[PDB]
Amino acid sequence: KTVIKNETGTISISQLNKNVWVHTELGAVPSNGLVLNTSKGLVLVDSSWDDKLTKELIEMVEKKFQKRVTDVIITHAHADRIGGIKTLKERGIKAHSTALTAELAKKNGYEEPLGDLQTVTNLKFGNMKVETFYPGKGHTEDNIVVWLPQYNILVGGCLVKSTSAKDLGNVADAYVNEWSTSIENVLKRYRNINAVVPGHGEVGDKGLLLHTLDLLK
Ligand SMILES: O=C(O)/C(S)=C/c1ccc(F)cc1
Ligand SMILES: [Zn+2]
Ligand SMILES: [Zn+2]
């Protein structure tokens, strides 16, 4: 498991496979996203808590992989996901989201992502296939998951709790009666999962989805 850290230790990238890395930043509260190394540029799943960390993350991966960050997929409109949106927009990085996530971003005072993702959207960056899926309300009204069909890797985002999470966390924006159905929708769509990246904590497998179901009881 190859891990690479910034000079301060607040940003780390860990390799899942040749072209897929998890990025983790400390805001201490760690948060995860993905880095996809594609033939057409780097694509991130999620930014980071604020613009300072987002700039550092972009600069680390551009230097390491020797290509530009071209696109980011924003999985919901909380700061751990979208806090670096100002940095993305001013650098000409495309910030993909559902329309609901964009609406919520604007309501909460953040610059707006594109609002281009539908309930199911299939993107392709070079040879890298990316599917985004809105499974329903859960951790937030707008949360989406991201699927890499060439690897059967699911980015659960904050809809999915890690093994170390012993409760649901802050549920102020959550829908705890719909969250279980939303997880079941993920389990029904993706029946063979190799790795599940939660929004916070260690990478796991389908067991993290079952763990989240148990925390909802
Ligand atoms: O638990 C999490 O994954 C998150 S991202 C919680 C959260 C953050 C900001 C809020 F306003 C509400 C909840
Ligand atoms: Zn959140
Ligand atoms: Zn979160």
Coordinates of all heavy atoms in Angstrom, one line a residue, residues 1-82, unseen atoms left out:
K1 N 0.8 -1.2 0.0 CA 0.0 0.0 0.0 C 0.9 1.3 0.0 O 1.3 1.7 1.1
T2 N 1.1 1.8 -1.2 CA 1.9 3.0 -1.3 C 1.2 4.2 -0.9 O 0.1 4.6 -1.4 CB 2.3 3.2 -2.8 OG1 3.1 2.1 -3.3 CG2 3.1 4.4 -3.0
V3 N 1.8 4.9 0.1 CA 1.2 6.2 0.7 C 2.3 7.3 0.5 O 3.5 7.0 0.7 CB 0.9 6.0 2.2 CG1 0.4 7.3 2.8 CG2 -0.1 4.8 2.4
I4 N 1.8 8.4 0.1 CA 2.6 9.6 -0.1 C 2.0 10.8 0.6 O 0.8 11.0 0.5 CB 2.8 9.9 -1.6 CG1 3.5 8.8 -2.2 CG2 3.5 11.2 -1.8 CD1 3.5 8.8 -3.7
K5 N 2.8 11.5 1.4 CA 2.2 12.6 2.3 C 2.9 13.9 1.9 O 4.0 14.0 1.4 CB 2.5 12.3 3.8 CG 2.0 11.0 4.3
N6 N 2.1 15.0 2.1 CA 2.7 16.3 2.0 C 3.8 16.6 3.1 O 3.9 15.8 4.0 CB 1.6 17.4 2.0 CG 0.9 17.5 3.3 OD1 0.9 16.5 4.1 ND2 0.3 18.6 3.6
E7 N 4.5 17.7 3.0 CA 5.5 18.0 3.9 C 5.0 18.2 5.3 O 5.8 18.1 6.3 CB 6.3 19.2 3.5
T8 N 3.7 18.6 5.5 CA 3.1 18.8 6.8 C 2.3 17.7 7.4 O 2.0 17.7 8.6 CB 2.2 20.0 6.7
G9 N 2.1 16.7 6.6 CA 1.3 15.5 7.0 C -0.2 15.7 7.0 O -1.0 14.8 7.4
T10 N -0.7 16.9 6.6 CA -2.2 17.1 6.5 C -2.8 16.6 5.2 O -4.0 16.6 5.1 CB -2.4 18.7 6.6 OG1 -1.8 19.3 5.5 CG2 -1.9 19.2 7.9
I11 N -2.0 16.2 4.3 CA -2.5 15.6 3.0 C -1.8 14.3 2.7 O -0.5 14.3 2.7 CB -2.5 16.6 1.8 CG1 -3.3 17.9 2.2 CG2 -3.0 15.9 0.6 CD1 -3.1 18.9 1.1
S12 N -2.5 13.3 2.3 CA -1.9 12.0 2.0 C -2.7 11.4 0.8 O -3.9 11.7 0.7 CB -2.0 11.0 3.2 OG -1.4 9.8 2.9
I13 N -1.9 10.7 0.0 CA -2.5 9.9 -1.1 C -2.1 8.5 -1.0 O -0.9 8.2 -0.9 CB -2.3 10.5 -2.5 CG1 -0.8 10.5 -2.8 CG2 -2.8 12.0 -2.6 CD1 -0.5 10.9 -4.3
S14 N -3.0 7.6 -1.2 CA -2.8 6.1 -1.0 C -3.3 5.4 -2.3 O -4.4 5.6 -2.7 CB -3.5 5.6 0.2 OG -3.2 6.3 1.4
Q15 N -2.4 4.6 -2.8 CA -2.7 3.9 -4.1 C -3.7 2.7 -3.8 O -3.3 1.8 -3.0 CB -1.5 3.5 -4.8 CG -1.7 3.0 -6.2 CD -0.4 2.9 -7.0 OE1 0.7 2.7 -6.4 NE2 -0.4 3.1 -8.3
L16 N -4.8 2.7 -4.6 CA -5.6 1.5 -4.7 C -5.3 0.6 -5.9 O -5.2 -0.6 -5.7 CB -7.1 1.9 -4.8 CG -7.7 2.5 -3.5 CD1 -9.3 2.7 -3.8 CD2 -7.5 1.6 -2.3
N17 N -5.0 1.2 -7.0 CA -4.5 0.5 -8.1 C -3.7 1.4 -9.0 O -3.4 2.6 -8.6 CB -5.6 -0.2 -8.9 CG -6.5 0.8 -9.5 OD1 -6.1 1.7 -10.1 ND2 -7.8 0.6 -9.3
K18 N -3.3 1.0 -10.2 CA -2.3 1.7 -11.0 C -2.8 3.2 -11.2 O -1.9 4.1 -11.2 CB -2.2 1.0 -12.4
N19 N -4.1 3.4 -11.4 CA -4.6 4.7 -11.8 C -5.5 5.3 -10.8 O -6.1 6.3 -11.0 CB -5.3 4.6 -13.2 CG -4.3 4.4 -14.3 OD1 -3.2 5.0 -14.2 ND2 -4.6 3.7 -15.3
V20 N -5.7 4.7 -9.6 CA -6.7 5.1 -8.7 C -6.0 5.3 -7.3 O -5.5 4.3 -6.8 CB -7.9 4.1 -8.6 CG1 -8.9 4.6 -7.6 CG2 -8.5 3.9 -9.9
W21 N -6.1 6.5 -6.7 CA -5.6 6.7 -5.4 C -6.7 7.4 -4.6 O -7.6 8.0 -5.1 CB -4.4 7.7 -5.5 CG -3.2 7.2 -6.3 CD1 -3.2 6.9 -7.7 CD2 -1.9 7.1 -5.8 NE1 -1.9 6.5 -8.0 CE2 -1.1 6.6 -6.9 CE3 -1.3 7.2 -4.6 CZ2 0.2 6.4 -6.8 CZ3 0.0 7.0 -4.5 CH2 0.8 6.5 -5.5
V22 N -6.6 7.2 -3.3 CA -7.5 7.9 -2.3 C -6.7 9.1 -1.8 O -5.5 8.9 -1.4 CB -7.8 6.9 -1.1 CG1 -8.7 7.7 -0.2 CG2 -8.4 5.7 -1.7
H23 N -7.3 10.2 -1.8 CA -6.8 11.4 -1.1 C -7.4 11.6 0.2 O -8.6 11.5 0.3 CB -6.8 12.7 -2.0 CG -8.1 13.3 -2.3 ND1 -8.7 14.2 -1.4 CD2 -8.9 13.2 -3.4 CE1 -9.8 14.7 -2.0 NE2 -10.0 14.1 -3.2
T24 N -6.6 11.9 1.2 CA -7.1 12.2 2.6 C -6.5 13.4 3.1 O -5.3 13.6 3.1 CB -6.8 11.0 3.5 OG1 -7.3 9.8 2.9 CG2 -7.4 11.2 4.9
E25 N -7.4 14.3 3.6 CA -6.9 15.6 4.2 C -7.5 15.8 5.6 O -8.6 15.4 5.9 CB -7.3 16.8 3.4 CG -6.9 16.8 1.9 CD -7.8 16.0 1.1 OE1 -9.1 16.2 1.2 OE2 -7.3 15.1 0.3
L26 N -6.7 16.4 6.5 CA -7.1 16.7 7.9 C -7.6 18.1 7.9 O -6.8 19.0 7.7 CB -5.9 16.5 8.8 CG -5.4 15.1 9.0 CD1 -4.1 15.0 9.8 CD2 -6.5 14.2 9.7
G27 N -8.8 18.2 8.4 CA -9.4 19.5 8.6 C -9.7 19.9 10.0 O -9.6 18.9 10.9
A28 N -8.7 17.2 14.9 CA -8.4 16.8 13.6 C -9.5 15.9 13.1 O -10.0 15.0 13.8 CB -7.1 16.0 13.6
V29 N -9.9 16.1 11.8 CA -10.9 15.3 11.2 C -10.5 14.9 9.8 O -10.4 15.8 8.9 CB -12.3 16.1 11.2 CG1 -13.4 15.2 10.8 CG2 -12.5 16.7 12.5
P30 N -10.2 13.7 9.5 CA -9.8 13.3 8.1 C -11.1 13.1 7.2 O -12.1 12.8 7.7 CB -9.1 12.0 8.3 CG -9.8 11.4 9.4 CD -10.2 12.5 10.3
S31 N -10.8 13.4 5.9 CA -11.9 13.3 4.9 C -11.2 12.7 3.7 O -10.1 13.0 3.4 CB -12.4 14.7 4.5 OG -13.1 14.6 3.3
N32 N -11.9 11.8 3.0 CA -11.4 11.1 1.8 C -12.1 11.5 0.5 O -13.3 11.8 0.4 CB -11.6 9.6 1.8 CG -11.1 9.0 3.1 OD1 -10.0 9.3 3.6 ND2 -11.9 8.1 3.6
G33 N -11.3 11.5 -0.6 CA -11.8 11.6 -2.0 C -11.0 10.6 -2.8 O -10.2 9.8 -2.3
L34 N -11.1 10.7 -4.2 CA -10.3 9.9 -5.1 C -9.5 10.8 -6.0 O -10.0 11.9 -6.3 CB -11.1 9.0 -5.9 CG -11.7 7.7 -5.4 CD1 -12.1 6.9 -6.7 CD2 -10.7 6.9 -4.6
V35 N -8.4 10.2 -6.5 CA -7.6 10.8 -7.6 C -7.6 9.8 -8.7 O -7.2 8.6 -8.4 CB -6.2 11.1 -7.1 CG1 -5.4 11.8 -8.3 CG2 -6.2 12.0 -5.9
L36 N -8.1 10.1 -9.8 CA -8.1 9.2 -11.0 C -7.0 9.7 -12.0 O -7.1 10.9 -12.5 CB -9.4 9.2 -11.7 CG -10.6 8.9 -10.7 CD1 -11.9 8.9 -11.5 CD2 -10.4 7.6 -10.1
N37 N -6.0 8.9 -12.2 CA -5.0 9.3 -13.2 C -5.4 8.7 -14.5 O -5.2 7.6 -14.8 CB -3.7 8.6 -12.7 CG -2.5 9.0 -13.6 OD1 -2.6 10.0 -14.4 ND2 -1.4 8.3 -13.5
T38 N -5.9 9.6 -15.4 CA -6.3 9.3 -16.7 C -5.4 9.8 -17.8 O -4.7 10.8 -17.6 CB -7.8 9.7 -17.0 OG1 -7.8 11.0 -17.6 CG2 -8.5 9.8 -15.6
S39 N -5.6 9.3 -19.0 CA -4.8 9.7 -20.1 C -5.1 11.2 -20.5 O -4.3 11.7 -21.3 CB -5.0 8.8 -21.3 OG -6.4 8.8 -21.7
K40 N -6.2 11.8 -20.1 CA -6.5 13.1 -20.4 C -6.4 14.1 -19.3 O -6.7 15.3 -19.5 CB -8.0 13.1 -21.0 CG -8.1 12.2 -22.2 CD -7.3 12.7 -23.4 CE -7.4 11.6 -24.5 NZ -8.8 11.3 -24.9
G41 N -5.9 13.7 -18.2 CA -5.7 14.5 -17.0 C -6.1 13.9 -15.7 O -6.6 12.7 -15.7
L42 N -5.9 14.5 -14.6 CA -6.4 14.0 -13.3 C -7.8 14.4 -13.1 O -8.2 15.6 -13.3 CB -5.5 14.6 -12.2 CG -4.0 14.2 -12.3 CD1 -3.1 15.1 -11.4 CD2 -3.9 12.7 -11.9
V43 N -8.6 13.5 -12.6 CA -10.0 13.7 -12.2 C -10.1 13.4 -10.7 O -9.6 12.3 -10.2 CB -10.9 12.9 -13.0 CG1 -12.4 13.0 -12.5 CG2 -10.9 13.2 -14.4
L44 N -10.6 14.4 -9.9 CA -10.8 14.1 -8.5 C -12.3 13.8 -8.2 O -13.2 14.4 -8.8 CB -10.4 15.3 -7.6 CG -9.0 15.9 -7.9 CD1 -8.8 17.1 -6.9 CD2 -8.0 14.9 -7.7
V45 N -12.5 12.9 -7.3 CA -13.8 12.8 -6.6 C -13.6 13.5 -5.3 O -12.8 13.1 -4.4 CB -14.3 11.4 -6.4 CG1 -15.6 11.4 -5.8 CG2 -14.3 10.7 -7.8
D46 N -14.3 14.6 -5.1 CA -14.3 15.6 -4.0 C -13.1 16.4 -3.9 O -12.0 16.0 -4.3 CB -14.8 14.9 -2.7 CG -16.2 14.5 -2.8 OD1 -17.0 15.4 -3.3 OD2 -16.6 13.4 -2.3
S47 N -13.3 17.7 -3.4 CA -12.2 18.6 -3.1 C -11.8 18.4 -1.7 O -11.6 17.2 -1.3 CB -12.6 20.1 -3.5 OG -13.5 20.7 -2.5
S48 N -11.8 19.4 -0.9 CA -11.4 19.3 0.5 C -12.0 20.4 1.3 O -12.8 21.2 0.8 CB -9.8 19.3 0.6 OG -9.5 18.8 1.9
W49 N -11.7 20.4 2.6 CA -12.4 21.3 3.6 C -12.4 22.7 3.2 O -13.3 23.5 3.6 CB -11.7 21.1 4.9 CG -11.7 19.7 5.4 CD1 -10.8 18.7 5.3 CD2 -12.8 19.1 6.3 NE1 -11.1 17.6 6.0 CE2 -12.4 17.8 6.6 CE3 -14.0 19.6 6.7 CZ2 -13.2 17.0 7.4 CZ3 -14.8 18.8 7.5 CH2 -14.4 17.5 7.8
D50 N -11.3 23.2 2.6 CA -11.2 24.6 2.4 C -10.3 24.8 1.1 O -9.8 23.9 0.5 CB -10.7 25.4 3.6 CG -9.3 25.0 4.0 OD1 -8.6 24.4 3.3 OD2 -8.9 25.3 5.2
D51 N -10.1 26.1 0.8 CA -9.3 26.4 -0.4 C -7.9 26.1 -0.2 O -7.2 25.6 -1.2 CB -9.6 27.8 -0.9 CG -11.0 28.0 -1.5 OD1 -11.2 27.3 -2.6 OD2 -11.8 28.8 -1.0
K52 N -7.3 26.4 0.9 CA -5.9 26.1 1.2 C -5.5 24.7 1.0 O -4.5 24.3 0.3 CB -5.6 26.6 2.6 CG -4.1 26.4 3.0
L53 N -6.4 23.7 1.5 CA -6.1 22.3 1.4 C -6.3 21.9 0.0 O -5.6 21.0 -0.5 CB -7.0 21.5 2.3 CG -6.5 21.5 3.8 CD1 -7.6 21.0 4.7 CD2 -5.3 20.6 4.0
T54 N -7.3 22.4 -0.7 CA -7.6 22.1 -2.1 C -6.4 22.5 -3.0 O -6.0 21.7 -3.9 CB -8.9 22.7 -2.5 OG1 -10.0 22.1 -1.7 CG2 -9.2 22.4 -4.0
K55 N -5.9 23.7 -2.8 CA -4.8 24.1 -3.6 C -3.6 23.2 -3.4 O -2.9 22.7 -4.4 CB -4.4 25.5 -3.2 CG -5.3 26.6 -3.7 CD -4.9 28.0 -3.2 CE -6.0 29.0 -3.6 NZ -5.6 30.4 -3.1
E56 N -3.3 22.8 -2.1 CA -2.2 21.9 -1.8 C -2.4 20.6 -2.4 O -1.4 20.0 -2.9 CB -2.0 21.8 -0.3 CG -1.5 23.1 0.4 CD -1.5 22.9 1.9 OE1 -2.4 22.4 2.5 OE2 -0.4 23.3 2.5
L57 N -3.6 20.0 -2.4 CA -3.9 18.7 -2.9 C -3.7 18.8 -4.4 O -3.0 17.9 -5.0 CB -5.3 18.4 -2.6 CG -5.9 17.1 -3.4 CD1 -5.2 15.9 -3.0 CD2 -7.4 17.0 -3.1
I58 N -4.2 19.8 -5.1 CA -4.0 19.9 -6.6 C -2.6 19.9 -6.9 O -2.1 19.2 -7.8 CB -4.8 21.1 -7.1 CG1 -6.3 20.9 -7.0 CG2 -4.4 21.4 -8.6 CD1 -7.1 22.2 -7.1
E59 N -1.8 20.8 -6.2 CA -0.4 21.0 -6.5 C 0.4 19.7 -6.3 O 1.3 19.3 -7.0 CB 0.1 22.1 -5.7 CG -0.5 23.5 -6.2 CD -0.5 24.6 -5.1 OE1 0.0 24.4 -4.0 OE2 -1.1 25.7 -5.5
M60 N 0.0 18.9 -5.3 CA 0.7 17.7 -5.0 C 0.5 16.7 -6.1 O 1.4 16.0 -6.6 CB 0.3 17.1 -3.7 CG 0.9 15.8 -3.3 SD 0.1 15.0 -1.9 CE -0.1 16.4 -0.8
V61 N -0.8 16.5 -6.5 CA -1.0 15.5 -7.5 C -0.6 15.9 -8.9 O -0.1 15.1 -9.7 CB -2.5 15.0 -7.5 CG1 -2.8 14.4 -6.1 CG2 -3.5 16.1 -7.9
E62 N -0.7 17.2 -9.3 CA -0.2 17.6 -10.6 C 1.3 17.4 -10.7 O 1.8 17.0 -11.8 CB -0.6 19.1 -10.8 CG -2.1 19.2 -11.1 CD -2.5 20.6 -11.5 OE1 -1.8 21.6 -11.2 OE2 -3.7 20.8 -12.0
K63 N 2.0 17.7 -9.6 CA 3.5 17.4 -9.6 C 3.8 16.0 -9.7 O 4.7 15.6 -10.5 CB 4.1 18.1 -8.4 CG 5.7 18.1 -8.4 CD 6.3 18.7 -7.2 CE 7.8 18.6 -7.2 NZ 8.5 19.6 -8.0
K64 N 3.1 15.1 -9.0 CA 3.5 13.7 -8.9 C 3.1 13.0 -10.3 O 3.9 12.3 -10.9 CB 2.7 13.0 -7.8 CG 3.1 11.5 -7.8 CD 2.3 10.8 -6.8 CE 2.5 9.3 -6.9 NZ 4.0 8.9 -6.9
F65 N 1.9 13.3 -10.8 CA 1.4 12.6 -11.9 C 1.7 13.3 -13.3 O 1.5 12.7 -14.3 CB -0.1 12.3 -11.8 CG -0.4 11.4 -10.6 CD1 -1.0 11.9 -9.5 CD2 0.0 10.1 -10.7 CE1 -1.3 11.1 -8.4 CE2 -0.3 9.2 -9.6 CZ -0.9 9.8 -8.4
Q66 N 2.2 14.5 -13.2 CA 2.7 15.3 -14.3 C 1.6 15.5 -15.4 O 1.8 15.3 -16.6 CB 4.0 14.6 -14.9 CG 5.1 14.8 -14.1 CD 5.6 16.3 -14.1 OE1 6.0 16.8 -15.2 NE2 5.5 17.0 -13.0
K67 N 0.5 15.9 -14.9 CA -0.7 16.3 -15.7 C -1.6 17.2 -14.9 O -1.4 17.3 -13.7 CB -1.4 15.1 -16.3 CG -1.9 14.2 -15.3 CD -2.4 12.8 -16.0 CE -1.3 12.0 -16.5 NZ -1.8 10.6 -16.8
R68 N -2.5 17.8 -15.5 CA -3.3 18.8 -14.8 C -4.6 18.1 -14.3 O -5.1 17.2 -14.9 CB -3.8 19.9 -15.7 CG -2.8 20.5 -16.7 CD -1.5 20.9 -16.1 NE -1.5 21.6 -14.9 CZ -1.9 22.9 -14.7 NH1 -2.3 23.6 -15.8 NH2 -1.8 23.4 -13.5
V69 N -5.1 18.7 -13.2 CA -6.4 18.4 -12.7 C -7.4 19.1 -13.6 O -7.4 20.3 -13.7 CB -6.6 18.8 -11.3 CG1 -8.1 18.6 -10.8 CG2 -5.7 18.1 -10.4
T70 N -8.3 18.3 -14.3 CA -9.2 18.9 -15.2 C -10.6 18.9 -14.7 O -11.4 19.8 -15.2 CB -9.2 18.1 -16.6 OG1 -9.5 16.7 -16.4 CG2 -7.8 18.2 -17.2
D71 N -11.0 18.0 -13.8 CA -12.4 17.8 -13.4 C -12.4 17.3 -12.0 O -11.5 16.6 -11.5 CB -13.1 16.7 -14.3 CG -13.2 17.1 -15.8 OD1 -12.2 16.9 -16.5 OD2 -14.3 17.4 -16.3
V72 N -13.5 17.7 -11.3 CA -13.8 17.2 -10.0 C -15.2 16.9 -9.9 O -16.1 17.7 -10.4 CB -13.4 18.3 -8.9 CG1 -13.8 17.8 -7.5 CG2 -12.0 18.7 -9.0
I73 N -15.6 15.8 -9.3 CA -17.0 15.4 -9.0 C -17.2 15.7 -7.5 O -16.6 15.2 -6.7 CB -17.2 14.0 -9.3 CG1 -16.9 13.7 -10.8 CG2 -18.6 13.5 -8.9 CD1 -16.9 12.2 -11.2
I74 N -18.2 16.6 -7.3 CA -18.6 17.0 -5.9 C -19.8 16.1 -5.5 O -20.9 16.2 -6.2 CB -19.0 18.5 -5.9 CG1 -17.9 19.4 -6.4 CG2 -19.5 18.9 -4.5 CD1 -16.7 19.3 -5.6
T75 N -19.7 15.4 -4.4 CA -20.7 14.4 -4.0 C -21.8 14.9 -3.1 O -22.8 14.2 -3.0 CB -20.0 13.1 -3.5 OG1 -19.3 13.4 -2.4 CG2 -19.1 12.5 -4.6
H76 N -21.6 16.0 -2.4 CA -22.6 16.7 -1.7 C -22.1 18.1 -1.3 O -20.9 18.4 -1.5 CB -23.3 16.0 -0.6 CG -22.5 15.8 0.7 ND1 -21.6 14.7 0.8 CD2 -22.5 16.4 1.9 CE1 -21.0 14.8 2.0 NE2 -21.6 15.8 2.7
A77 N -23.0 18.9 -0.9 CA -22.7 20.3 -0.6 C -22.3 20.7 0.8 O -22.6 21.7 1.3 CB -23.8 21.2 -1.1
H78 N -21.5 19.8 1.5 CA -20.9 20.2 2.8 C -19.4 20.5 2.5 O -18.8 20.2 1.5 CB -21.0 19.0 3.7 CG -22.3 18.8 4.4 ND1 -22.7 17.6 4.9 CD2 -23.3 19.7 4.7 CE1 -23.9 17.8 5.5 NE2 -24.3 19.0 5.4
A79 N -18.8 21.2 3.5 CA -17.5 21.8 3.3 C -16.4 20.8 3.0 O -15.5 21.0 2.3 CB -17.1 22.6 4.5
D80 N -16.5 19.6 3.6 CA -15.5 18.6 3.3 C -15.5 18.2 1.9 O -14.4 17.7 1.4 CB -15.6 17.4 4.3 CG -16.9 16.6 4.1 OD1 -18.0 17.2 3.7 OD2 -16.9 15.4 4.4
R81 N -16.6 18.3 1.1 CA -16.7 18.0 -0.3 C -16.4 19.2 -1.2 O -15.8 19.0 -2.2 CB -18.1 17.4 -0.6 CG -18.6 16.3 0.3 CD -17.8 15.0 0.2 NE -17.0 14.8 1.3 CZ -16.1 13.8 1.4 NH1 -15.8 13.1 0.3 NH2 -15.5 13.6 2.5
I82 N -16.9 20.3 -0.8 CA -17.1 21.4 -1.7 C -16.3 22.7 -1.3 O -16.3 23.7 -2.0 CB -18.6 21.8 -1.9 CG1 -18.8 22.5 -3.2 CG2 -19.1 22.6 -0.8 CD1 -20.2 22.7 -3.6

